[PDB]
Amino acid sequence: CKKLTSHQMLSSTEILKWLREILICRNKFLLKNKQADRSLLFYGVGTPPICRQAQTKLEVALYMFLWNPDTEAVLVAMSCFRHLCEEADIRCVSVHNLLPNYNTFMEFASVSNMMSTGRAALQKRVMALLRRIEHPTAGNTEAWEDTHAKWEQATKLILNYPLSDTDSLQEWINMTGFLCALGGVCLQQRSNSTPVSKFMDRLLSLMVCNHEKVGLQIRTNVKDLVGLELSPALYPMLFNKLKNTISKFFDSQGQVLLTDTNTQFVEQTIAIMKNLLDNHTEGSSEHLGQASIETMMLNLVRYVRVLGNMVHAIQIKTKLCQLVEVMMARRDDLSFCQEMKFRNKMVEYLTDWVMGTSNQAADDDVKCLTRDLDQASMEAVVSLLAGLPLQPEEG
């Protein structure tokens, strides 16, 4: 396990296969002993017992394997998960008393049996299974932080160095999704026990990365991972961080600090929020209804006010209108302290958006973009006003 986590196994596929064989033989001998003598039990089942530490190294290395940028290793790791579940069952009546997340490991076997049409589908299935991992066992906690350390170190290498690293970029993209989907266990443990906070803090810096080495691909991958891959339990932290990130663009009087980086962050945040709300994650409702999207949406609207009339500004306004419609479609999922004033505010702010340059434009492209923006704004306004009583602010 130390050799494998060291990540110098040039023949890691065969090593994993033989490790599967060794685990199978270990479980077979354990079953033979248990049939011979029920109680092994006092040598690893209750310095801590050496068998417990060995199993911890086993699960840490197995969690590393799912992140390995290869393709055949995922099946090896899932078979090893199935064998670990089998040996946990043999040693034992609830099997969750030893491995609380045994359901996810059992689902790993069904995931492994089904044919994968490339690494991308297998990678997505691994992210989904990690999202399904609820109980924060010690193996996940050790593996997640250790994998994060490798991810953090490889993060600097791509950026700091000013090619052949396409494989490294793919591995880092896999690491991002791995940490996003498996990050829920660490945060849940920290709630009843932070490095989890620094994960998004580095992530927050990611969307505005401008590096000479294919920064556009990095931004696209980061946005896609943050949107689709992120676990539901990490939602409140994402909302809290994004609110304060957006709140730094306005002065004390409320003057917007208009900057290219600020606009890029705003348009990344809009795209990511649209992707997040559009996707119906399993159990996301019970977690999205804790933080509020009120202040951040309001600030984004205030910033988009001064976006101007350029093509980029029109596209940003259309995307924001689509986001407003999508968010309004899920009022039940979200929790609002004061929905009435919120909806009135956006209705009053969006009323100005419609019919902006429907006559003063001199080009069809300007006219087409204006018509698209007007249609999107009208759709958003119609969505807002369904059931919206009118109550003007203090007059």
Residue 240 identity? N
Among candidates 236, 234, 267, 265, which has minimal Cα distance to 248?
265
Instruction: Classify burial at 361, counting beta carbons within 10 Å of its beta carbon; exposed 0-12, middle 13-18, buried 19 or more.
Output: middle
What's the rounded Cα separation, in Å, for the pair 327 and 261?
25
CB atoms within 10 A of CB 249: 20
What's the rounded Cα separation, in Å, for the pair 71 and 48?
35
Q: What are phi and psi of 250, to 5 degrees?
A: -115, 135
How far is CA 368 from each of CA 271, 308, 315, 316, 356, rounded to the nearest angstrom?
Answer: 22, 16, 11, 15, 12
Question: Technique behind this structure?
Answer: cryo-EM
**Neighbouring-strand partners of residue 256:** 250
Q: Are 183 and 215 contacting, i.e. CB atoms less than 8 angstroms apart?
A: no
CB atoms within 10 A of CB 106: 16
Among candidates 202, 7, 228, 279, which has minimal Cα distance to 120?
228
Q: What are phi and psi of 119, to 5 degrees?
A: -70, -30
**Helix-helix angle 311-328:294-305, to 10 degrees:** 160
Q: Are 365 and 315 contacting, i.e. CB atoms less than 8 angstroms apart?
A: no
Q: Is the dihedral of CA 292, 294, 299, 305 positive or negative?
A: positive
Radius of gyration (Cα) for the chain, nearest Å?
25
What's the rounded Cα separation, in Å, for the pair 388 and 54?
60
Range 159-197 burial, b when 16+ CB lie within 10 A, else e: eeeeeeeeeebebbbbbbbbbbbbbbbbbbbeeeeeebe
What's the rounded Cα separation, in Å, for the pair 203 and 221?
12
Among candidates 204, 245, 239, which has minimal Cα distance to 222?
204
Residues near 195 by Cβ (< 8 Å), separated by ≥ 6? 145, 148, 186
